[PDB]
Amino acid sequence: MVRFSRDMLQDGAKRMFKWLRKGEGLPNYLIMYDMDRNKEYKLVPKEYAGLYESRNIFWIKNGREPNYVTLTSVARNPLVMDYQNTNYTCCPTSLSLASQMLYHYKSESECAKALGTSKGSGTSPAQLIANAPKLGFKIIPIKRDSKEVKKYLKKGFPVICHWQVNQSRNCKGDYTGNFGHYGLIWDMTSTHYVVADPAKGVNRKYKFSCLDNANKGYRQNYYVVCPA
Amino acid sequence: MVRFSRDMLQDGAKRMFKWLRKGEGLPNYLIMYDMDRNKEYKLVPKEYAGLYESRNIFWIKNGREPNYVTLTSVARNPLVMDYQNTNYTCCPTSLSLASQMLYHYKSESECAKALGTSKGSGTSPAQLIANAPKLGFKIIPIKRDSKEVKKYLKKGFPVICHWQVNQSRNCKGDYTGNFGHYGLIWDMTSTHYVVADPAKGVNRKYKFSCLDNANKGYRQNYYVVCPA
Secondary structure (H helix, E strand, O other): OOEEEHHHHHHHHHHHHHHHHOOOOOOOOEEEEOOOOOOEEEEOHHHHHHHHHHHHHHHHHHOOOOOEEEOOEOOOOOOOOOOOOOOOOHHHHHHHHHHHHOOOOOOHHHHHHHHOOEOOOEOOHHHHHHHHHHHOEEEEEEOOOHHHHHHHHHOOOOEEEEEEHHHHOOOOOOEOOOOEEEEEEEEEOOOEEEEEEOOOEEEEEEEHHHHHOOOOOOOOOEEEEEEO | OOEEEHHHHHHHHHHHHHHHOOOOOOOOOEEEEOOOOOOEEEEOHHHHHHHHHHHHHHHHHHOOOOOEEEOOEOOOOOOOOOOOOOOOOHHHHHHHHHHHHOOOOOOHHHHHHHHOOEOOOEOOHHHHHHHHHHHOEEEEEEOOOHHHHHHHHHOOOOEEEEEEHHHHOOOOOOEOOOOEEEEEEEEEOOOEEEEEEOOOEEEEEEEHHHHHOOOOOOOOOEEEEEEO
16 A cells, blocks of 8 residues: 655645646646655546545644555545534634645634634635635635536635525524524535535535525625635 | 533433433433523424534534533534544544444543554454443444344444445445444435445445445444443
């Protein structure tokens, strides 16, 4: 079983982030050299997604990068559910999840510090757009339009969503409280957005109209995350 | 919104755990006293599952109990995905996940300490059965059969599964490579087991035969987790 070192994983992720800059989706393969005999391997997407999934599991659970990862599994993407650690860090947790998909991981607290997240006010949309460059990202505000989410998901860019959980009570039913909330759209079906909700789970499905109309009275955008 | 203190949550977990010990499923409601008004509140299954889900999110992410939890959400269960912290702690992570479902949470490291998990050999099924009572649990070794698995899920008892990931390669492509592995069966469809796999994700669907027959040459059981 081939293993790759901390230095090699960092190098491969930078090259992944760099390819993603083009807005042309994920590369067909990723070159990696094992730490034992330094042989060249051309990992296909399900392989490099599986490898970086394992890397992110250890990093998120232990809070430090793994010194090496063994290729043991395959995956459709490198996303690992990461829950918000406080009741006010939903926005930087969603940006952290995006950072996984872009192969430029920044922890929840690192994002919190950059975005200026606060206990009284949380994080506003302008705070997310204005401070994402500190972490190497650009935010593209788009219309709350499923064709727009779908267009940017093809480019490899996940989409941070913002809504008032009370407005989703009848069309989704996850929440009974009243507050604004952020999650990450990372996939879609023909009818639903698939959202990684940092207070609920990794595949919370919202009918397009349910999420689209749940921010009535608040900023009418979603927020694409891409390399700066 | 209605909030409950740590002391009421700890006590309500005891009463849920003591109720489940009867082997008659979950109670129809859970009565708890509010932390502001000190008023009686009758939570239905979706409310007490959501409250303890939120409690468990904070507990797992922060490594310490929340001082209070506000009732904000509903859920069909209190399970929060929790990943293994090393390449050898799959079994105590699976037991910790079970302990959430039983309303008697013990962390991954508390479980590994109790089970005697070791970096060299992981944990055997005999170590699981013999040491789980230290944490308040009883393990019932059961046949690798969906009929049996459904019977104990109906009683509220999750089922630790054990298999060789190479033997599941062609019927469920999650893994490449050869090693034994543990997860938690916490639900089933008409045809598949729903497995929380501490190395991959919370809802890995395994067809009954694929999981049952993937442990040839090793102990032919699954492991029901219940209150001692």
